[PDB]
């Protein structure tokens, strides 16, 4: 197993090669469309429902794990993302409404 | 060529080489497994199941 590269970033690459960087959710983007689909399917009638749904997603799990990087306000107030999730949902539903 | 105590040693990792053109590094093979198990044979299965691996 070989790589050809610049010597500077190799240092960065070395860590990666040790399989270190984990799976980290990209549901930020695909949140919206998915949410829309769910709505269409005919069950998400409230933002509470949406929040509940989101809990089953890996994004939520990721947030719970290591929040701050994922745009997160604070853990003490939310506890289990019960405001953050809402915020996300709200964001989704304004844009969706507009379209 | 020579090797030095460097970043992410492990220290199971054990190679370094050099040139004035490019600084060339090698790494040995990943470790082979410790065995505290039975390599599960096929005959231990039920009858139909042994056509999993024909």
Swiss-Prot record, chain A:
Highest taxon of the lineage: Eukaryota
Location in or out of the cell: Nucleus
Family per record: Belongs to the helicase family. SKI2 subfamily.
Additional notes on this entry: Present with 1440 molecules/cell in log phase SD medium.
Task of the protein: RNA helicase that plays an essential role in pre-mRNA splicing as component of the U5 snRNP and U4/U6-U5 tri-snRNP complexes. Involved in spliceosome assembly, activation and disassembly. Mediates changes in the dynamic network of RNA-RNA interactions in the spliceosome. Catalyzes the ATP-dependent unwinding of U4/U6 RNA duplices, an essential step in the assembly of a catalytically active spliceosome.
Domain commentary: Contains two helicase domains. The N-terminal helicase domain has catalytic activity by itself, contrary to the C-terminal helicase domain that may have a regulatory role and enhance the activity of the first helicase domain.
Quaternary structure annotation from Swiss-Prot or TrEMBL: Component of the U4/U6-U5 tri-snRNP complex composed of the U4, U6 and U5 snRNAs and at least PRP3, PRP4, PRP6, PRP8, PRP18, PRP31, PRP38, SNU13, SNU23, SNU66, SNU114, SPP381, SMB1, SMD1, SMD2, SMD3, SMX2, SMX3, LSM2, LSM3, LSM4, LSM5, LSM6, LSM7, LSM8, BRR2 and DIB1. Interaction with PRP8 is important for recruitment to the U4/U6-U5 tri-snRNP complex.
Name this polypeptide is given: Pre-mRNA-splicing helicase BRR2
Organism: Saccharomyces cerevisiae (strain ATCC 204508 / S288c)
Organism taxonomic ancestry: Eukaryota, Fungi, Dikarya, Ascomycota, Saccharomycotina
Gene responsible for this protein: BRR2
Full protein: residues contained: 886 to 984 of 2163
């Amino acid at each position: 197993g070989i790589i050809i590269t610049d010597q500077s970033n190799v240092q960065y690459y070395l860590s990666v090669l040790n399989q270190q960087l984990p799976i980290e959710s990209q549901f930020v983007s695909k949140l919206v469309d998915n949410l829309n689909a769910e709505v269409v399917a005919g069950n998400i009638k409230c933002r509470n429902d949406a929040v509940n749904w989101l809990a089953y997603t890996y994004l939520y799990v990721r947030m719970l794990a290591s929040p701050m990087l994922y745009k997160v306000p604070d853990i003490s107030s939310d506890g289990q993302l019960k405001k953050f999730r809402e915020s996300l949902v709200h964001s989704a539903l304004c844009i969706l409404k507009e379209q | 060529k020579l090797m030095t105590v460097t970043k992410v040693s492990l220290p199971e990792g054990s190679f370094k080489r050099v040139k004035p053109q490019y600084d060339e590094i090698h790494i040995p093979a990943p470790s082979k497994p410790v065995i505290d198990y039975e390599l599960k044979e096929i005959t231990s299965l039920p009858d139909w199941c042994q056509e999993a691996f024909p």
